[PDB]
């Protein structure tokens, strides 16, 4: 790696340097630089690994979009044919997409994920591993989608699991992970009455468990249940 | 597109 | 290059694609392979060549700064040492910078400059030589300083020598070049009074001649001539 | 920042 002769403490701060600069993609170096050292991840250092590769996917995601919905315009009845330079173009996204996810992913199997004990950290990787099965899932078309499919679930009900065991309504990892698996269920499988019914007891579960807050944490996660609520509708 | 975080 | 094997007529269009999915360093890589072909660019094939390192270096440019702040923050009396990084960080977005300047520059100098006979097409590159020097220099420090300066001033003026003698005073080029001109000279070339004399002169000059354009054209002179403006309202 | 196009 690139990054192994820089200190570990190095990293993290060059980290959050490219943040600030929003130079995402050397944040993400930085920080896959800082998960190989081997040692666990702090909270604050998970929100920094997790920002930085969901504003690189992100940003290549709207990418595909829009290059998928001009292929797709080429391929209806009365286009004039273009070449196959639209769908190169589209697979090249799509191919350093799906890198990037299989990078991720390879982060929390090697071994993030194995050495999370405590509830918080294991239920944030278990939740980054159906986010980038979801991601990979996206663009699936192949003799493996349903697998990609069931790989993002697989990993988000894990976390469920866990998080309805030992983390209270109101935590916001709980409620981004929720969030999330609704969205799955929603746009992935096709499951929209599920997508619904979660977004609304997530958000119900939450409202009932504010009083127990700081003012701090009420601000986390009164904001996370207004997109819960926007997602809710959207779809109704 | 929907939310997420 | 990784662009030798795609048609010219490939490269282009996939540049258009790029701008559209705001991938711009794609953008700029596909535009380096169609110039590398080695046949001239046409007006539109020169406008996209310019926006996509425009945007590239802008985004560097940009990160650069809030980095620059940062590091010298850290160098003032009263900051506590945090060590090389900063500085380490900020060299390398520096580097990264300088090389895609260097890339431009390379790319004007073999061989658009010299086959570019027509006056529009020989000031674009003149004024791109410009503010590629330009943006070389906001970030120099060393013996060749005042050489990458002087760099940028003989390009500037070269260009707005024979913009005079050939394009009217309300051609887009010819406005955007003297706006970019009268910026080095305020910001780089520390002559305040020559960046304000340069933008008055132009904005008049453009001003005299709006009754000869169709609505059209006059669209694209008075955004310009509205920058002009907006910088003289700046620094007077 | 100035403008510059
Ligand atoms: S302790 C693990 C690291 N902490 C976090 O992930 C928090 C970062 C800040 N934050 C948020 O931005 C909001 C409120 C939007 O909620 C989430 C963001 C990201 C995730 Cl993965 C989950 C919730 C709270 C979490
Ligand atoms: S004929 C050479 C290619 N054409 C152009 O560069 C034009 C692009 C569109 N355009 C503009 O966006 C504005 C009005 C902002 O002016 C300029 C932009 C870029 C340059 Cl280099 C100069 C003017 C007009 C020029
Ligand atoms: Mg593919
Ligand atoms: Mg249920
Ligand atoms: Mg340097
Ligand atoms: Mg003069």
Not at chain 1, 86 to 111: F, I, N
Not at chain 1, 215 to 233: G, P, V
């Amino acid at each position: 790696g690139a990054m192994g002769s820089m200190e570990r403490a190095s990293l993290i701060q060059k980290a959050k340097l490219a943040e600030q600069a929003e130079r995402y993609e050397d944040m993400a170096a930085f920080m896959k630089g800082a998960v190989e050292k081997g040692e666990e991840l702090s909270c604050e250092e998970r929100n920094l690994l997790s920002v930085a590769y969901k504003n690189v996917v992100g940003g290549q995601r709207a990418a595909w979009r829009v290059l998928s919905s001009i292929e797709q315009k080429s391929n209806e009845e009365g286009s004039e044919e273009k070449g196959p330079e639209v769908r190169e173009y589209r697979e090249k996204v799509e191919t350093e997409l799906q890198g990037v996810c299989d990078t991720v992913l390879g982060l929390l199997d090697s071994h993030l994920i194995k050495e999370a004990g405590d509830a918080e950290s294991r239920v944030f990787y278990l939740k980054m591993k159906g986010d980038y099965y979801r991601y990979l899932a996206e663009v699936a078309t192949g003799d493996d989608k349903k697998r990609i499919i069931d790989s993002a679930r697989s990993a988000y009900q894990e976390a469920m699991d866990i998080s309805k065991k030992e983390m209270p309504p109101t935590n916001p990892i709980r409620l981004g992970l929720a969030l999330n698996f609704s969205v799955f269920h929603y746009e992935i499988a096709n499951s929209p009455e599920e997508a619904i019914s979660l977004a609304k007891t997530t958000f119900d579960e939450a409202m009932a468990d504010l009083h127990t807050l700081s003012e701090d944490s009420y601000k986390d996660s009164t904001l996370i249940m207004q997109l819960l609520r926007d997602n809710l509708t959207l779809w109704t | 597109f929907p939310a997420t975080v």
